[PDB]
Amino acid sequence: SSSAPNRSASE
Amino acid sequence: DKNELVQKAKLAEQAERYDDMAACMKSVTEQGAELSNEERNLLSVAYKNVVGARRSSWRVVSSIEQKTEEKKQQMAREYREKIETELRDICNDVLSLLEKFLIPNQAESKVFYLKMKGDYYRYLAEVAAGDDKKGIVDQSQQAYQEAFEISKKEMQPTHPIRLGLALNFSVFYYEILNSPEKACSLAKTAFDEAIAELDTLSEESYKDSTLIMQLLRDNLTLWTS
Amino acid sequence: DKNELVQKAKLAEQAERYDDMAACMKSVTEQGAELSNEERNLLSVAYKNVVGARRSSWRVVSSIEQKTEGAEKKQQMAREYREKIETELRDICNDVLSLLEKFLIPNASQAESKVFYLKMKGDYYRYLAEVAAGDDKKGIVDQSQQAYQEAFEISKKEMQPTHPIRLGLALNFSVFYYEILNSPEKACSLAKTAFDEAIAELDTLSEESYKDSTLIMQLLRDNLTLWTS
Fold this sequence. Notes:
The complex is a heterotrimer, with 1 copy of chain A and 2 copies of chain B. By secondary structure, chain A is low in regular secondary structure.
């Protein structure tokens, strides 16, 4: 059922 | 100035944290201006997300509570009631703003603000308790009724507002009134009426209209099923 | 009792309402008793999440500022908004820092826990260093480095790189060397030495630890290529 709508890294 | 408030709201949207977005768009609105469709959409994005996070939380916590067999369940309840009191506070915070400024002020604008009132009563209705659950749903159906009249007279069935009425109003009918027949009548009417303009749609609203209609089609499948 | 707050924390997690999960485990910190690894992990998740939300916000506003640098008054206002993020971010970090410094690090008895908290102190000072400027930046970076190094010199004795908390340290410490010390050769040498010290035993790991280790080592390895590239 549904309704209306509107490079590094680490640990 | 209203413009710098609107800009700070936009910035909070872009940062993707919305409580300061809503808390700014509020004080945009208290100038009593007619919110143009952009700031109107920003106000919806803001309060919708600010409530939507609570709605998600509430669904999760209610599920956990149901999954309880104690301080455990009591605590789950107490957190739920905190979430609900947040969500109530925010909805009241919107509904009073509409009543005091927006609904006091074009057919499109009328319909938009009235739908919004309906939906915020609906999100109370998901959370409401006691006999005033009726008064909430009543004031929602009152708003949706004024919306549906204005839109059926003064929105072509191409209009995405007119469909957003029917879609949310039907979700109200099924989730709040458990009346799938009432939902599907309005939904199918709106869906086929939009198909009566299926090629008349605007170059963007093709995607809009078809997405709204896809959600109509799916929940029509639900409520018929 | 903290026993209740543990459930309150899990509840605050599942809602994605981490602020309350942190506010719970924070008062679990003030119990002064030694956290179990379960509580330690909860507290880590909690403040890592609560900071992460502000980190992501801050980077986004910071980018928007640098995208629009010619835009005068709205650039000024975007800066005011940005600082109005940074002060929140800082307050959250100083919270967790003081909580570590006055309860957990003073108490931590396990070498593993000593490592975990000394790491975590390093991390949060890094998250401040990412924010700070000038002599504030200098001091915070220094004390982050001090905390990492203290953990690093401990874990080098006390843990094989077969244990994931040591790899997590080596990863974050190397991210600090690259990102904050601007020391990419030091970063790569640290990251690689950690990785290949892990390779030397990579097949000896246990059923979970190999998953955990591999999950981290792939980040070591990918950072190594990112920086060598």
